[PDB]
Amino acid sequence: LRQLNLNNEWTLDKLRQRLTKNAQDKLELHLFMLSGIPDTVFDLVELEVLKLELIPDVTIPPSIAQLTGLKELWLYHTAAKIEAPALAFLRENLRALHIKFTDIKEIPLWIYSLKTLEELHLTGNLSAENNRYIVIDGLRELKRLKVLRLKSNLSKLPQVVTDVGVHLQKLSINNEGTKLIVLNSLKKMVNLTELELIRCDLERIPHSIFSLHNLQEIDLKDNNLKTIEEIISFQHLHRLTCLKLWYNHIAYIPIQIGNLTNLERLYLNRNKIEKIPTQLFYCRKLRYLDLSHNNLTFLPADIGLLQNLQNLAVTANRIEALPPELFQCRKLRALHLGNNVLQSLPSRVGELTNLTQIELRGNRLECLPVELGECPLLKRSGLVVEEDLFSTLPPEVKERLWRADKE
Incomplete structure (x- = not known):
């Protein structure tokens, strides 16, 4: 009766009305506080992201095999029970598995028998008695993993992850303020490209970080670096292209940062930089520059050395004037x-x-230059501006912008 009423209350049409999309632009379905999974879910054939949130001890029927495009699967506080045809279709189709838990028993024992598993986020503590990485000991059986996000309050890394890393390309460990013992056991990350230590609180850079030649994304976020001094040994690593050093205690940038040229998305926001140097503008390939929430004394002219730069965010700084060199750059968006x-x-x-x-709520701009109205790609949504200084502009220019907005 409950399953019949579940199909009665949750119909295919209602699921299609609620059907949404995830960050990867894939068809997702957020089932929150359900007693079970209705068979109307499983009648679908185009679903790719089956999200299961807080369902008490559900049993998955085989009709999941009909969901022909199924690739992702979200388990959040959900004890999942599955059978063998389901395991077959997930061994031939499913290449992602997102498991969120607060208990060992919430994590099912079937999830280690997939033959196409590629993307995998384990959220929740994985260290326990006879279960520290032994909850998930079947991660040797998964030979195609490429993304491993671990929000687990972790203190050590298993070697088996390092073995899998021949094909794995992204490892982001969230630990809520717990230091891992690296001990240079990460050097089998030949294929790793994005090492993201979120809230690691390292305060130091081990040699394994700048030994791995394929690393391109490096953000030591909330690691409380008072000093960053290990960028010199990164030149053996030919592939680094984006140093998003944000949300850190970095007091100063040494002038040797001028040696780099190849970065594009240099995001040095949420720091304690006293002033941006001219050396930092020796980087010619910069396409994106975020310096939000810093103590910059002023804005120098050499910011205009950035021709390919697309977005620039020097928000929450102490900056008074933009130089003409910055306006020679045609690509500011x-x-x-x-x-x-x-x-x-x-x-x-x-x-x-x-x-x-552009964001101008704040600042000290006495009146709008009409050139701010001249920018074509800058629309009303982009020109987040005060209204009175906009009214100081001639009404016909405002009419032209309005007609561009509405026609």
Whole structure:
């Protein structure tokens, strides 16, 4: 009767109305506080992301094999019970498995028998008596993993992950403030490209970080680096392209940072940098620069050495003037310049063409230059601006912008 009523209350049409999409632009279904999975879910054939959230001890019927495109699977606080045809279709189709738990028994024993598993986030503590990485000891059987996110309050890394890393390319461990013992056991990360130590609180960089030649994304977020001194040994690593050093206690950048040229998305936001140097603008390949929440004394001119730069966020700084060199760069799009001490924007901003989004709530801009209205790609959604100084502009320019908005 409960299953019959579950199909009665949750119909295919209602599921289609609730059907949503995930971060990967894949068809997801968020089933929150359900007694079970209705068979109307399993009548689908195009579903790819089956998300199961807080369902007490559900039993998965074989009709999941009908969901022909099924690739992801989200288990959040859900004890899952599955059978063999389901295991077959998941061994031939399923390449992702997102397990969130607060207990060992919430983690099922079937999930280690998949023959196509590729993406895998384990959320919840995996260290226990006879169960520290022995909950999940079947991760040797999974020989195609490529992404491993571990929000587990972890203190050590298993060697078996290092063995899997021949094909694994992303390992992000969240530990809520627990230091792991690396001990240079990570050097089998030949295929790793994105080592993301979130809230690791390392305060130091081990040699295994700058020994792994394929690493391209390095963010030592919330690791309380007072000093960063290990960038010199990164030149053996030919593939580093993005140093998003954000949310850290970094007091100063040494001038040797001017030696780099190849970075694009240099995100040094949420730090304690006293001033941006001209050396940092020796990097010619920068396409994105975020310096939000810093103690920058002013904005120098050499910021205009960035021709390919697309978004620039020097938000929450102490910056008064934008130089004409910055406006020689034609590719500025997202200028998050707000909550600053900007005196004025020099009229050479008329050289700008590709401006899309700007934030000016805050600052000290006495009146809007009409050049801010000149930017074509900058629309009303992008021009987040005060209204009175917009009214100071001639009404017909405002009418032209309005007609561009509405036609």
